[PDB]
Amino acid sequence: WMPAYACQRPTPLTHHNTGLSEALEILAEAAGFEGSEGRLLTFCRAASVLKALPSPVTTLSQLQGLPHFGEHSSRVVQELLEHGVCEEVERVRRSERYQTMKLFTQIFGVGVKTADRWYREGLRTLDDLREQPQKLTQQQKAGLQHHQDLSTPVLRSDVDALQQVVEEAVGQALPGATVTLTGGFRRGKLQGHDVDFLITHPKEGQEAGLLPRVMCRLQDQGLILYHQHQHSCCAFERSFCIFRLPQPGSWKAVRVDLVVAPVSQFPFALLGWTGSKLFQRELRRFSRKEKGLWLNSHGLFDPEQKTFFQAASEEDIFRHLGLEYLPPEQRNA
Ligand SMILES: Cc1cn([C@H]2C[C@H](O)[C@@H](COP(=O)(O)OP(=O)(O)OP(=O)(O)O)O2)c(=O)[nH]c1=O
Ligand SMILES: [Mn+2]
Ligand SMILES: [Mn+2]
């Protein structure tokens, strides 16, 4: 017996069912490309169940008694076990719609809605996009300019080098300010599509105006290819960057997300930003459905009492929701 919510079970970085989960996640992704959010969540949940299993699924009798394994997901696994291939998955992979949506959505600054609009307007290739620059935001233009580098997986060695330059810029700008690696790398992943950093200072308010000073310093060093600063609107101050990472004899563009949070909200921001996306979806669903509380990256709110939970750590937040603590490396749902 394995719990239904991904936030109630450990999901390690590496598991025994990568072929099966990858097939399900292709179907999940394709459903998201078509706007079928329910079907996406269904396939994603089924894939995450396989990730938590302690052993490989070699016979279909091993699916018996597992949550989130309805008919469609079971059939996928069945065809894979019996034939080594699932024809729906292979049709999806080869389809022009999926390949194009995948191409466009992996461009920096392009979501599903934009990608689908461009598809419907007869755009197919990266060159087609380049021929219509009036259709692109500045962020999207930067993404296209650097798309080869931005499609190259980011390595832990890249992350280490980047964290050093970000730490130096932060340390110079404001003594005492801290940089915390979040995102998939904090969950132990060995590769990723970007690097995520969360910046704070232990005195509430000392972080005001820090990010722009950090960016000035990084810019002066030649380390920034693209930078979009956004002030908090509703809602953290952040900078969407492409860094020019020096390498032995060349350089690579790398996506970096810098997020500033006031230290009061830091444990919520850390939790939210550490992911995985599905784990956080599941944790927020759990908080709302099971405990009546709204969790987001800024706080945990009781909307009946009209109160906010004070947390000093991620552990406090788990405790408050009635969940066993999961370290970041077990949140790979
Ligand atoms: C869009 C959004 C994401 N997040 C979270 C969810 C993600 O788990 C987390 C990091 O985003 P990413 O950098 O997209 O995801 P990742 O680091 O888990 O994986 P990858 O290797 O592909 O980079 O940010 C928020 O907290 N608030 C938001 O508004
Ligand atoms: Mn990331
Ligand atoms: Mn990111």
Which position among 127, 158, 160, 194 bears the catalytic label?
Answer: 194
Please state the φ and ψ torsions of residue 91, each to the nearest 5 degrees: -60, -45
The CA distance from 135 to 120, in Å, is 13
Q: Which residues contact 90 (CB under 8 A, 6 or more apart)?
A: none
User: Beta 250-260 vs 195-200: how paired, if at all?
Assistant: parallel
User: Are residues 182 and 274 in contact, defined by beta-carbon separation less than 8 angstroms?
Assistant: yes
The CA distance from 320 to 310, in Å, is 10
Mutation to probe ligand 1, out of 29, 155, 194, 242 (largest number of atoms < 8 A from CB): 194
Atom of ligand 1 nearest to the CA of 191: 21
Q: Is 160 a catalytic residue?
A: no
User: Are residues 136 and 151 in contact, defined by beta-carbon separation less than 8 angstroms?
Assistant: no
The CA distance from 309 to 113, in Å, is 35
* HSE, side-chain direction, 13 A CA sphere, residue 295: 28
For Cα atoms 212, 214, 215, give the angle at the middle one, nearest 5 degrees: 65
Q: Is 257 a catalytic residue?
A: yes
**194 annotated as belonging to a binding site for a ligand:** yes
Tell the residue nearest (CA) to atom 24 of ligand 1.
273
Best CA proximity match to 48, nearest among 89, 4, 6, 1: 6
Instruction: Transcribe 132-151 into DSSP letters.
Output: -GGG--HHHHHHHHTHHHHH
Please state the φ and ψ torsions of residue 295, each to the nearest 5 degrees: -100, 135
Return the amino acid letter for 58. Answer: T
Kindly list the structural domains of the chain, giving each domain's residue range(s) and its CATH number in brackets, ordered by start. 1-95 (1.10.150.110), 96-152 (1.10.150.20), 153-263 (3.30.460.10), 264-332 (3.30.210.10)
User: Are residues 215 and 239 in contact, defined by beta-carbon separation less than 8 angstroms?
Assistant: yes
User: Are residues 297 and 305 in contact, defined by beta-carbon separation less than 8 angstroms?
Assistant: no
Using CB distances shorter than 6 Å, the residues near ligand 1 are: 183-184, 189, 192-194, 196, 257, 272-273, 275-277, 280, 297
Atom of ligand 1 nearest to the CA of 277: 8
The CA distance from 37 to 31, in Å, is 7
Residue 44 burial (10 A CB sphere; 0-12, 13-18, 19+): buried
Nearest ligand for residue 240 CA: 3
The CA distance from 307 to 310, in Å, is 10
* HSE, side-chain direction, 13 A CA sphere, residue 79: 13
**257 annotated as belonging to a binding site for a ligand:** yes
Strand partners, 226: 242
Strand partners, 156: none
The CA distance from 244 to 255, in Å, is 9
The CA distance from 29 to 27, in Å, is 6
Experimental approach: X-ray
For Cα atoms 34, 5, 19, give the angle at the middle one, nearest 5 degrees: 60
Atom of ligand 1 nearest to the CA of 275: 8
CA of 80 to the centre of ligand 2 (A): 30
The CA distance from 84 to 153, in Å, is 28
Atom of ligand 1 nearest to the CA of 196: 13
The CA distance from 237 to 20, in Å, is 39
Q: Is 153 left (phi over 0), alpha (psi -120 to 50) or beta?
A: beta
For Cα atoms 197, 203, 204, give the angle at the middle one, nearest 5 degrees: 80
Return the amino acid letter for 16. Answer: H
Tell the residue nearest (CA) to atom 17 of ligand 1.
183
User: Sign (positive/negative) of CA torsion 10, 311, 307, 261?
Assistant: negative
User: Are residues 154 and 184 in contact, defined by beta-carbon separation less than 8 angstroms?
Assistant: no
Q: How far is CA 142 from CA 193, 225, 242, 243, in A?
A: 15, 8, 8, 11
User: Are residues 25 and 43 in contact, defined by beta-carbon separation less than 8 angstroms?
Assistant: yes
The CA distance from 181 to 11, in Å, is 20
Strand partners, 181: 197
Spell out the SS3 assignment of 271-298.
Answer: HHHHCCHHHHHHHHHHHHHHHCCEEECC
Q: How far is CA 33 from CA 37, 115, 142, 292, in A?
A: 9, 9, 23, 31
Residue 250 burial (10 A CB sphere; 0-12, 13-18, 19+): exposed
Q: How far is CA 201 from CA 124, 164, 231, 232, 326, in A?
A: 46, 18, 17, 17, 25
Q: Is 302 a catalytic residue?
A: no
Best CA proximity match to 76, nearest among 53, 110, 42, 119: 42
Residue with token string 């079971």: 74
User: How many C-beta atoms lie closer than 10 Å to residue 292's C-beta?
Assistant: 11
Nearest ligand for residue 276 CA: 1
The CA distance from 104 to 118, in Å, is 8
Which tokens sit at 34? 């078509």
CA of 10 to the centre of ligand 1 (A): 19
Which position among 116, 127, 149, 257 bears the catalytic label?
Answer: 257
